[PDB]
From TrEMBL, chains A, B:
The keyword Protein biosynthesis does not apply. Its main location: membrane. Belongs to the transpeptidase family. The chain holds residues 61 to 589 of 744 of the full protein. Keywords: Membrane, Transmembrane, Transmembrane helix. It comes from Staphylococcus aureus (strain NCTC 8325 / PS 47). Signal peptide: none annotated. GO terms for cellular component: plasma membrane. This is Penicillin-binding protein 1.
Length: 504, 504
């Protein structure tokens, strides 16, 4: 028969996916089966058999009888409700001692946590003819040649199921409240790059197949976003190191005219001549345009490239999107400074953000801990911390971190809804416009925003980074604009900090 | 945003897959949208709107009214029923001039023939956030990087849509009649290895997604079979070339005792001492075991290996199965001589069978004619005839072909139901036992057979090879044993021979 497909484990050894034995119900209905035998080998009483079978399977007795009455057939099955039956279901049916009724063992792929990190783990599909399982998405697909067999190798993830629960629960909350078109959250260990939790909405249920195929793209590695103002931190880091950002230097706020278009601070008028530090706390768009002018267009492109953007991070997911740095003209360049036109993956954002908490060294994020075989003990692969690049100095990092502290904790902050009681939080907010897939423009509406937060806690020396974004709320779009992802970040961040024994 | 994904063509240039424009229905329901305008820009009459809208979309107005009556919402959409709407559907709705009602264009992937070579062409899935299309099976998947974009490249197949119809129609016939667990048919140009038509059952509908994912395996390249007595031709080819098969020399029919198991000819008793040609006409199992004894176990293993079995043919389908030559012991070796224990892909059988019609040269089967871009005119790839290997001599091929002629047309033939009026037909039959997917035995039952025919016509100098197999008929399983796949081979072969202008 088939070799046992390897298991997918979480960082603490909990099974995320495995092979189990289930059972399919089979009924011989042709009288010829009992010709030679003393006790009947087929269904004599269709009515009683159907009545009694409906006590285990989710079928009405008239339907079982209908299927039981098909002609020119030796055996019948009962569709979706005849299979994936439990060992308990088997025993119930066998005690019934129904003639012609049997249960046939079948291998199924079992996901013990159901809808749980689904767009990461993936789904294995079965070929009924041979029972052969073949991964169709995520880890099951990426690592299909190892997982398959004699027994396949196991794949151990960096995911912590305890932190994953916090994420899953938070995302359910977001959907209920905001019904967004797309949504994701990811928790990364701030010192190693390990992905401790990831999920997205909408997603699917690996165990039932529900909604599988409706959205093939994994948001972390394969989808791309105009990030919005969370992108401002890398412009700021560049400005700091080049000697263009002085936190106390004043600058002319208000607007800039770019190729005949008005790019304004979010209040249209600005605040007059204000210190550069305050403008970042306000998320002043003119600040970033001004800083770009200081550093230089050519230099700013290299800066964004040296932060990893526009190229794949080379993770172990299939089809990793590279994004692109929008630099074709001044309008694209100026809008890229606050995170429009340029497109990114969430994994790129995690990689760049990590520079500020590792003396300027970007960490390559990673989610595969081990591929190894449990019978032979052969280890094929082992994940590890890896520096993707050191684009800034330690001094620049600390100076970036000070403005991220002020974004949340300045008296003039517009991000106090992201604060958590007992825990010092910092990060950067984003409210970004999202391109219409057909239409060549931005999606229109009262608040047609991709709202996001790139946060970390405890501030200065964080244990985890939390990045969460929500695209185009369809319910409560006013609150989505006012609160961003704060109703996701707080329950994720707080519960993780508690589980990791960080002190309040 | 997205480039146009390239097209999939048939050998004569008919579109099998392309990008089209469809439509999604959008209803603004907030009064603020019509606040500034004189005529309402939102849905004022929800009841009338819902009643009228249900004349186009598959939704009952009681449900439409509920969705139109959601709070904290500006716009609403209508799920799966609100999208993939046609231009005809669009004009109808716009004729209603319902307030707040709009149509938004979306790119969809269109398969003009619906359920048509579906397990070869495949299906591309859409990521709603960006509209980006991604092949999930078949040619759409294999050639996704070429089809994707700026405009994607085209993929031209060797399939002839005209012959495909014959196959599609015959396979529908078999299902209705026999309800098999598995079924496939394939037409190959006998002199080039081109795949002119292929299909399987059950399958899916690329255009709607119906039943997609239910069975991932492509029967031609990815599924494996104990072929049964169609495998005998390669044993015969070996014996001929080794000097062990003489058509007129007699042999002891009846049975052989192999490792304590009695393996008999299909009528249990045999026919006494009969000539070897007649035994092949009868599909005598003991003949093949006797021939194996003559040639030698080791030599016979090289023979099946040199006919290509046990290794992938190195085609351009993903995850091509290798099969295996079942040789662990005498019982496995001896049953392999009549096509059990050993497993194969249909593509291997086609490759080996072509030897008999090309002076012994095996042809590599192939189905991709061209990958090229219609804007730049760059050709990335062009398919061609290729000799997989010449395992036998011209003389041995001719001698095999003579026994395949007698299999169908001897006065003592047991295969006359495969004859076609006006056309000289030849081939080899198979009635094989099928291994239990979970368990250690063969599927049990009245006629638990994988029945097949490996045929070609016109005989001796055929224009096409037709291979068809049917696994485990659930309806009319007795007739399946008596007629094999003849109710599929005859209409496929006859309609193709006529379409190809072969004279009756
Ligand atoms: C950064 O993301 C920046 N976004 C914008 O300038 C867009 N165009 C915008 C969206 C809504 C209202 C005004 C402008 C903004 N940064 C933030 C933030 O930090 O969340 C906000 C709220 C507006 S300015
Ligand atoms: C070849 O396929 C061969 N098959 C068998 O010997 C199996 N074990 C069998 C199945 C049904 C009945 C008897 C034996 C047979 N070849 C053929 C044929 O050419 O189709 C038949 C019908 C029986 S012997």
């Amino acid at each position: 028969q088939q070799p046992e497909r390897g298991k997918i484990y979480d960082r603490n050894g909990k099974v995320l996916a495995e092979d189990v034995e289930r059972y399919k119900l089979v009924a011989v209905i042709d009288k010829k089966a009992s010709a030679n035998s003393k006790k009947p080998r087929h269904v004599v009483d269709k009515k009683e058999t159907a009545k009694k079978l409906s006590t285990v399977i989710d079928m009405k007795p008239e339907e079982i009888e209908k299927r039981l009455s098909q002609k020119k057939a030796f055996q019948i099955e009962f569709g979706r409700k005849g299979t994936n039956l439990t060992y308990q279901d088997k025993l119930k049916i066998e005690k019934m001692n129904l003639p012609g009724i049997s249960l046939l063992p079948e291998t199924e792929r079992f996901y013990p946590n159901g809808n749980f990190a689904s767009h990461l783990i993936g789904r294995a599909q079965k070929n009924p003819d041979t029972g052969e399982l073949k991964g169709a998405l995520g880890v099951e697909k990426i690592f299909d040649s190892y997982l398959s067999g004699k027994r396949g190798d196991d794949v151990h993830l960096t995911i912590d199921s305890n932190i994953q629960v916090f994420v899953e629960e938070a995302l359910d909350g977001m959907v209920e409240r905001y019904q967004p078109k797309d949504l994701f959250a990811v928790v990364m260990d701030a010192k190693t790059g390990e992905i401790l939790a990831y999920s997205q909405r909408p997603t699917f249920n690996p165990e039932t197949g529900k909604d599988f195929g409706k959205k093939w793209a994994n948001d972390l590695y394969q989808n791309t976003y105009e990030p919005g103002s969370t992108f401002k931190s890398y412009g700021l880091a560049a400005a700091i190191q080049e000697g263009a950002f002085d936190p106390d230097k004043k600058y002319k706020s208000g607007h800039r005219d770019i190729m005949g278009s008005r790019i304004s601070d979010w209040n249209r008028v600005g605040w007059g001549e204000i210190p550069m530090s305050l403008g970042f706390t306000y998320s002043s768009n003119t600040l970033m345009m001004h800083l770009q002018d200081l550093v230089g267009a050519d230099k700013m492109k290299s800066w964004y490239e040296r932060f990893g953007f526009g190229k794949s991070t080379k993770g172990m997911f299939d089809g990793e999107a590279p994004g692109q740095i929008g630099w074709s003209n001044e309008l694209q360049q100026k809008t890229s400074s606050f995170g429009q036109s340029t497109t990114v993956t969430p994994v790129q954002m995690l990689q760049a953000q990590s520079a500020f908490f590792n003396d300027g060294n970007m960490l390559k994020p990673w989610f595969v801990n081990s591929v190894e075989n449990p019978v032979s003990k052969r280890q094929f692969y082992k994940g590890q911390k890896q520096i993707a690049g050191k684009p800034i100095t330690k001094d620049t990092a600390e100076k970036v971190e000070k403005q991220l502290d002020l974004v949340v904790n300045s008296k003039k902050s517009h991000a106090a809804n992201y604060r958590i009681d007992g825990y010092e939080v910092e990060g950067k907010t984003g409210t970004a416009q999202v391109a219409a897939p057909n239409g060549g423009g931005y999606v229109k509406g009262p608040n047609p925003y991709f709202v996001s937060f790139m946060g970390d806690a405890p501030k200065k020396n964080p244990k985890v980074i939390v990045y969460a974004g929500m695209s185009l709320a369809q319910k409560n779009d006013q609150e989505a604009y006012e609160l961003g992802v704060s109703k996701a970040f707080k329950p994720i961040m707080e519960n993780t900090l508690k589980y990791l024994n960080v002190g309040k």
